């Protein structure tokens, strides 16, 4: 099965998932000199006041914080988007060292990690239908750099010891994802894909310009997770990022001047 190891990593995925070589793959490098301001783009509307987190799960490739998405509670609207997108889960990608870990890059700079807040377009009724549509998902991507601690991340870090291995989950209620958002909502946007198999070309990417700061101790705890299941040979969950893919016939638009 696919992964990030020595023999099943991103360069192998195309054998089982040929869309890996498609026209709309993610992530990409964001060339800040070529992305053009688009005065038609609106401010993002992030409405997380009513978010209901439920559970945290180590799925063998990352950990997902899952939300109740059975009604419009936490939603993303505005920006480049038409209609309403409901938050279903967030997760991160991160490195073995601070100098790598993000999926998107900015002028080729890799950040220590990247947070993905995943939302689906409610006009398609359920998530599984949305991933089959070119405008099915909106993923809000936020870079992490190592510096001061992020207070709103600590609840996540402290539960990680309880979900060390693949297939473990823990209850995770009452977590407020607003504590993971930088000050500014300036962004870049482009049409792309899921960055893990099945690599479906169903995502409107919204990547915030301003990174959040997390401490070295916080990220170190991410790196103590395991890709493997309980009892199996230990493989630290690090470097679970796909590198940048060809931009092809796409334009990256900026929300800011
Ligand atoms: C404290 C739990 C995690 N939440 C936050 O950090 C947070 C929430 C709302 C706003 S506000 N209302 O200023 O846009 C700012 C911060
Ligand atoms: C469809 C099979 C389950 N996969 C997902 O739901 C999914 C995959 C990648 C991303 S990402 N890393 O592009 O935010 C978000 C969601
Ligand atoms: Zn992701």
Residue 200: phi and psi, rounded to 5, are: -65, 145
Does residue 186 contact residue 106 with C-beta atoms inside 8 Å?
no
Give Cα 125 to chain centroid, integer Å. Answer: 22
| Nearest CA-CA partner of 151 in 213, 85, 196 | 213
Give the residue ranges of the annotated binding site. 91, 93, 116, 195-196
Cα 152 from Cα 10, distance rounded (Å): 31
Helix (H) / strand (E) containing 221: helix 216-222
| Nearest CA-CA partner of 155 in 138, 178, 134 | 178
Does residue 205 contact residue 26 with C-beta atoms inside 8 Å?
yes
Q: In the chain, what is the straight-line distance between the N-terminal and C-terminal CA atoms, in Å? A: 44
Does residue 140 contact residue 87 with C-beta atoms inside 8 Å?
no
Ligand nearest to the CA of 114: 3
With DSSP H G I counted as helix, E B as strand and the rest as coil, what are the percentages for the chain, rounded to 5? 15, 30, 55
| Nearest CA-CA partner of 207 in 63, 28, 22, 21 | 28
Q: Which residues are catalytically annotated?
A: 61
Helix (H) / strand (E) containing 156: helix 154-159
Q: Which residues contact 168 (CB under 8 A, 6 or more apart)?
A: 57, 58, 162, 230
| Nearest CA-CA partner of 248 in 32, 38, 22 | 22
Q: Is 107's C-beta closer than 6 angstroms to any atom of ligand 1? A: no
CATH architecture of the domain covering 1-257: Roll (3.10)
| Nearest CA-CA partner of 68 in 171, 193, 154 | 171
- Atom 13, ligand 1: which residue's CA is nearest? 178
Cα 232 from Cα 176, distance rounded (Å): 33
Both tokens assigned to 155: 């609840």
The residues with which 66 forms a beta bridge, in sequence order, are 55, 89
Nearest atom, ligand 2, residue 193 CA: 13
Both tokens assigned to 202: 């169903």
| Nearest CA-CA partner of 90 in 133, 144, 9, 37 | 144
Does residue 254 contact residue 106 with C-beta atoms inside 8 Å?
no
| Nearest CA-CA partner of 9 in 242, 245, 246, 244 | 242
What DSSP letter does each residue of 86-150 carry, written as one string? EEEEEEEEE-SSTT---SSEETTBPPSEEEEEEEEEGGGSSHHHHTTSTTSEEEEEEEEEESS--
CA distances from 39 to 34, 36, 67, 79, 107 (A): 15, 9, 33, 11, 22
| Nearest CA-CA partner of 113 in 101, 125, 103, 105 | 101
Classify residue 222 by its DSSP letter: H
Kindly tell me the sign of the dihedral angle through the C-alpha atoms of 200, 203, 209, 214: negative
What DSSP letter does each residue of 225-241 carry, written as one string? -BSSPTTSPP-B-----
- Atom 2, ligand 2: which residue's CA is nearest? 198
CA of 85 to the centre of ligand 2 (A): 15
């Amino acid at each position: 099965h696919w992964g990030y190891g020595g023999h099943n990593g991103p360069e192998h995925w195309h054998k089982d998932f040929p869309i890996a070589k498609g026209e709309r793959q993610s992530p990409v490098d964001i060339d800040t000199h070529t992305a053009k301001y688009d005065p038609s783009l609106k401010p993002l509307s992030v409405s997380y006041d009513q978010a209901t987190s439920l559970r945290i799960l180590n799925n063998g490739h990352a950990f997902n914080v899952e939300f109740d998405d059975s009604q419009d509670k936490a939603v993303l609207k505005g920006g480049p988007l038409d209609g309403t997108y409901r938050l279903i889960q967030f997760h991160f990608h991160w490195g073995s060292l601070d100098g790598q870990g993000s999926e998107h890059t900015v002028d080729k700079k890799k950040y220590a990690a990247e947070l993905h807040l995943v939302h689906w377009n409610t006009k398609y009724g359920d998530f599984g239908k949305a991933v089959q549509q070119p405008d099915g998902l909106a993923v809000l991507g936020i870079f992490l750099k190592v510096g001061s601690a992020k207070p709103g991340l600590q609840k996540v870090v402290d539960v990680l010891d309880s979900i060390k291995t693949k297939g473990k989950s823990a209850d995770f209620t009452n977590f407020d994802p607003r504590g993971l958002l930088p000050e500014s909502l300036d962004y870049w946007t482009y049409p792309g894909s899921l960055t893990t198999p099945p690599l479906l070309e169903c995502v409107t990417w919204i990547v915030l310009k301003e990174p959040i700061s997390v401490s070295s101790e916080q990220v170190l705890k991410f790196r103590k997770l395991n890709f493997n299941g309980e009892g199996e040979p230990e493989e630290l969950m690090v470097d679970n990022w796909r590198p940048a893919q060809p931009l092809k016939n796409r334009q990256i638009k900026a929300s800011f001047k």
